[PDB]
């Protein structure tokens, strides 16, 4: 099973009608240079570390 | 929220307007200044004021302020 | 502090708003060692609408 | 002898709520026009050096359905 480590950078905001969801851009630590935006379920600030279970499929707006 | 009502902001204006020599970047003395230099009816309203008239003061130093 | 806690309504209708009146009682005492004269001089005058003065004597 | 009564006129009735209420009562019982009654009561209190005054008349006059009126002049404050 591949694992993937990404450092959160810059809180972009809340999506999801309810609002519990939070869009953030992250940076990989296993070779940086590339960043990707993710949707989160819990509370998040800058410099957190997210286990991307699959390192390549970013999302956008939630309903 | 901590938005100062007009009465505080109004009064700070009036005081910086005509006591810029005297007055300081220091609240503590701006406080005491307010006593001699203006009647106010409550200790709370005075610091509320003097704190803000210090704020306005502290950033006139770094350029003008409209009003 | 004498509290009285009551419904505002004369009747029953409405959300049940409760309201507590209060009356504060302040009591002092000053102990004096003085002759018969000053005592009465000090009791009769120094009076005031609102303050209840009580003078007791006694060893006990 | 343990009880003693002393009457004593008041300094300017024109700043005594109770004074002016009872005046209207009386005014209105000699049947002055509603507004004439109250409007003078305002304009005397004012004269007696008040910083604001205000009168309400609620209830029923001549018509069947109940009404109410504000009569006010000068400055009031209402809170705290």
């Amino acid at each position: 099973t591949p694992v993937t480590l990404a450092k959160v950078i810059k809180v972009l905001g809340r999506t999801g009608s309810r609002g519990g969801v939070t869009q953030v851009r992250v940076e990989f630590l296993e070779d940086t240079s590339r960043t990707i935006v993710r949707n989160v379920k819990g509370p998040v600030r800058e410099n957190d570390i997210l286990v991307l279970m699959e390192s390549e499929r970013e999302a956008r707006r939630l309903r | 929220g901590r938005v100062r009502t007009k009465t505080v902001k109004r009064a700070s204006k009036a005081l910086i307007e005509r006591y810029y020599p005297k007055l300081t970047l220091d609240f503590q003395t701006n406080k005491r200044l307010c006593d001699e230099i203006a009647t106010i009816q409550s200790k709370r309203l005075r610091n509320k004021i003097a704190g803000y008239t210090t704020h306005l003061m502290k950033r006139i130093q770094k350029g003008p302020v409209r009003g | 502090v004498l509290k009285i806690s009551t419904r505002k309504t004369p009747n029953g209708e409405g959300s049940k708003t409760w309201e507590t009146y209060e009356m504060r009682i302040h009591k002092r005492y000053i102990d004096l060692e003085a002759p018969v004269q000053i005592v009465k001089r000090i009791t009769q005058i120094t009076i005031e609408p609102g303050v209840d003065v009580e003078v007791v004597v006694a060893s006990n | 002898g343990t009880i003693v009564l002393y009457a004593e006129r008041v300094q300017d009735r024109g700043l005594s709520a109770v004074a002016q209420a009872e005046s209207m009562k009386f005014k209105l019982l000699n049947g002055l026009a509603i507004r004439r009654a109250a409007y003078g009561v305002v304009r005397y209190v004012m004269e007696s050096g008040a910083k604001g005054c205000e009168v309400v008349v609620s209830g029923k006059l001549r018509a069947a359905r109940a009404k109410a009126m504000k009569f006010a002049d000068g400055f009031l404050i209402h809170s705290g």
């Binding site: 379920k41 819990g42 957190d48 279970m53 939630l62 309903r63 | - | - | -």
Partner: protein, 206 residues
Amino acid sequence: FTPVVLATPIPEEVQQAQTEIKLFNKWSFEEVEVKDASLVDYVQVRQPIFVAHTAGRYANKRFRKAQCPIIERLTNSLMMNGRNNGKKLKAVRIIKHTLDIINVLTDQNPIQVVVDAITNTGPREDTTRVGGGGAARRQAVDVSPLRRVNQAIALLTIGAREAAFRNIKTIAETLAEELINAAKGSSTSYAIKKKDELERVAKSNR
């Protein structure tokens, strides 16, 4: 350890372990580490404590909740289901007890097995109901470290509580048991099943 005694005497082992190391009930904070990346920061351990009771203001600000010593975080979460609401003294004792049991079994800093089980039972990603139009499908997300710690605590505790319910075995054992099994997950713990079944469904929608 340079002995010292005054008027009202202070107990041997008490002088002995305290003044030296600042360790737990009588367990070691040092060594103990968060074996998964992240979770560091969002799991305490150091500063070290004696027992897990504290008048801690971990509430009045958003994230400071993180700073609470994770052993005592665990304990707080032990004291619920209305009948046990409050009752920290009751709880704390279970942990002291629990940690002893965890210890007896498979050696190891018991305070570290706690660390393993927590790290090991929080969902790395999850689902959330999305508008989509009435028939609201399931959109996947990656979950916060904080959220991931919290769920681990709550999951761990619950599974034991329900194990403890209606049976001879005590809170402390089932809690110890739940943990020990959750150290490196073993499909028999209420939490791992729930983690795994949660990531089953999370991966079931992307």
